[PDB]
Task: inverse folding
């Protein structure tokens, strides 16, 4: 049932590199991102 | 009787506008957004 | 203070208030007034134009 | 305490009173109306929305689900 594959610990670092945070001018305190919360609803 | 009646001193016609601008700056507006239509009218309904 | 009051820090007393928490502060920014309209719409507490009335 | 006696009537207490009318009357839908809202906890820029979130759930997730979302044209 085994196969030849990579390690999951490597998969961790890969996705963390592809993801990056964001910076918006409208970042309220009680609700994080105002534009994001708008379209969700 | 005149103690009750309004005067132009105590009105709020500018303090509305100051708050609405705080909304537009704070809130995103688009054509799909329900606020965009009414506010741009509201601005004309003071300055006009 | 803490000695006069400490029961605030139960997980259950806080996780339950977070639902009420965001609803109050997401009030001005988002169309929750619509949610109020649908909430009344289910039980027919809305009042439309097409419909008939003797009010 | 004097300030509380001063800015009493000037205080805003209408929003809180509204929710009380909600939970009291429609006790059922109110649980849904409040459950409908759930802001995102953390944002994230670049990614491949197809399966990046897929693998982002399988690995690199601890008591917190990850997923895609729209934005102001993004």
Result:
């Amino acid at each position: 049932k085994k196969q030849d594959q990579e390690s999951i610990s490597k998969k961790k670092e890969k996705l963390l590199k592809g993801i990056q945070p964001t910076d918006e001018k409208l970042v309220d305190k009680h609700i994080g991102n105002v534009p994001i919360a708008q379209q969700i609803v | 009787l005149d103690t009750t009646r309004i005067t132009k001193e105590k009105t709020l016609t500018e303090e509305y506008r100051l708050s609405i601008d705080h909304l537009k700056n704070s809130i995103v507006t688009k054509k799909g957004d329900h606020l965009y239509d009414d506010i741009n009218l509201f601005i004309k309904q003071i300055s006009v | 203070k803490l000695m006069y009051s400490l029961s605030k820090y139960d997980r259950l007393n806080i996780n339950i208030n977070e639902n009420f928490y965001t609803f109050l502060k997401s009030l001005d920014k988002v169309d929750v007034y619509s949610l109020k309209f649908f909430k009344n719409m289910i039980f027919n507490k809305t009042y439309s134009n097409y419909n008939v009335n003797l009010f | 305490x004097x300030x509380x006696x001063x800015x009493x009537x000037x205080x805003x207490x209408x929003x809180x009173x509204x929710x009380x009318x909600x939970x009291x009357x429609x006790x059922x839908x109110x649980x849904x109306x409040x459950x409908x809202x759930x802001x995102x906890x953390x944002x994230x820029x670049x990614x491949x929305x197809x399966x990046x979130x897929x693998x982002x759930x399988x690995x690199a997730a601890a008591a917190x689900x990850x997923x895609x979302x729209x934005x102001x044209x993004x």
Summary: DSSP finds two helices and no strands in chain A. The longest helix of chain A spans residues 8-18.
